[PDB]
Subunit: 263 residues, 2 copies
């Protein structure tokens, strides 16, 4: 049974979150778009394997939109990690296996580096280290343009346009409003702040991934860093949203990976 | 400037080869298709930067078709390297900077591992380590189907279909006949013989690349291996045929990369 709710943390954010299952904690941090409904399908799969899974809309995004502007402006992995930690304390989550793509991945690494005690294992996916030229000036145009552009960009990187489309009108309407907000506070500050320094990656176990169909250059640097640092690195079917494109495989990956760090 | 002709080596191969320029030797080994006309444009560029460039059609392919059956069957990097050494011996090329993609890349590595004394530096591109899904049963259909399917597959991996097409009707007619032959003796034996062990990679300088637009999973292992072994690794624009898709950029890479090892 899926638990759905809202909670107001001490930092003023009114979080929308979902939980399912019991057992060791698994946390699914969304990507930059901050829409946790993208994890709906995988959520059940994971939970069914003896895990309590928690996900949520990111501050200022979708259902967690009632939050202070600072929580969605000048965003970095560490900033977002700070918020997550507060939320986890509020939900009494002591330690967890954390997944995250893009900014969510930056957050995972930030958590791995600065709050090692709260992380059982980190699963970052496509950590932004550079700013694709397709973005670059995405925070200068009008909201409608950003929305139209980012929707096309996101769908293109979906790894499966059918499944992407099948997220539904509710989700896409929420995504429509998130795009501009994302554009103003993420692309410029997230990449440069990526916690990929040597000292950020060895406090807890890390299992890094990149989209199998993602063009090599986009996250080439992720692979080189992982390899050079001796961190498990691999691919997942799909591109930027494996949890949407290939929910069964995504679930299997998260379950198998987390399972190996449990007693 | 450019010389074009044939030379019959002691192994029975009647090679079609081309040379241009003066100075240190640079050898451009074609990919699995074994068509050296793909190097036409970049060859001039490289030759004009103070190098003597040598290229050729691979054994049993294109203009190098008059060759014993053995030379195009059960192909491995080492097998091809043996033929190349004989060719180089006949052309009096003692030491060279060698470029190679796919099977060509496997050959480069084979040369680096087994004939280090003949290699100034190796520039392998997209070394096949696994036989990709798309070519699992390629040999199981009619030759006409093989030609059609492989022409499509190659065009899709061209990195620039306009440039691919622009190789010309003559090249494509030759490629048409090469496809089936390549399918019978390459894809099943090339990948398993990849000289990518630790013992094959430290005898001479190597500068490894993968296509920037190539789907990550395809040559994902190339990146990990290079990085783990501390070998220079980067991307080149395009996909599988950088010398066709981005001739100028390709030529620049070969020149700069080779130039740095000169003494």
């Amino acid at each position: 049974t899926r638990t759905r709710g809202y909670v107001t943390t001490k930092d003023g954010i009114k979080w929308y979150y979902e939980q399912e299952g019991s057992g060791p904690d698994v946390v699914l941090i969304p990507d930059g778009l901050g829409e946790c409904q993208m994890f709906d399908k995988p959520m059940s799969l994971i939970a069914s394997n003896g895990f309590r899974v928690t996900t949520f809309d990111m501050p200022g995004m979708s259902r967690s939109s009632d939050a202070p502007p600072e929580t969605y402006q000048d965003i970095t992995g560490r900033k977002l990690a700070g918020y997550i930690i507060t939320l986890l304390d509020t939900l009494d989550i002591k330690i967890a296996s954390v997944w995250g793509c893009a900014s969510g991945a930056s957050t995972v690494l930030a958590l791995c580096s600065d709050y090692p005690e709260r992380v059982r294992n980190g699963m970052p996916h496509e950590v932004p280290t550079e700013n694709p030229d397709i973005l670059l000036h995405i925070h200068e145009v009008d909201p409608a343009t950003i929305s139209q552009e980012m929707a096309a960009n996101s769908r293109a990187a979906s790894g499966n346009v059918e499944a992407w489309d099948a997220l539904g009108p509710e989700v896409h309407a929420r995504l429509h409003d998130n795009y501009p907000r994302w554009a103003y506070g993420y692309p410029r500050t997230i990449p440069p702040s990526a916690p990929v320094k040597t000292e950020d990656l060895h406090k807890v176990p890390i299992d890094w991934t990149v989209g199998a169909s993602t063009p090599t250059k986009l996250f080439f640097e992720n692979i080189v860093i992982a390899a050079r640092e001796g961190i498990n690195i691999g691919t997942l079917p799909g591109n930027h949203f494996p949890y949407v494109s290939h929910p069964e495989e995504f679930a299997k990956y998260v379950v198998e990976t987390s399972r190996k760090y449990l007693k």
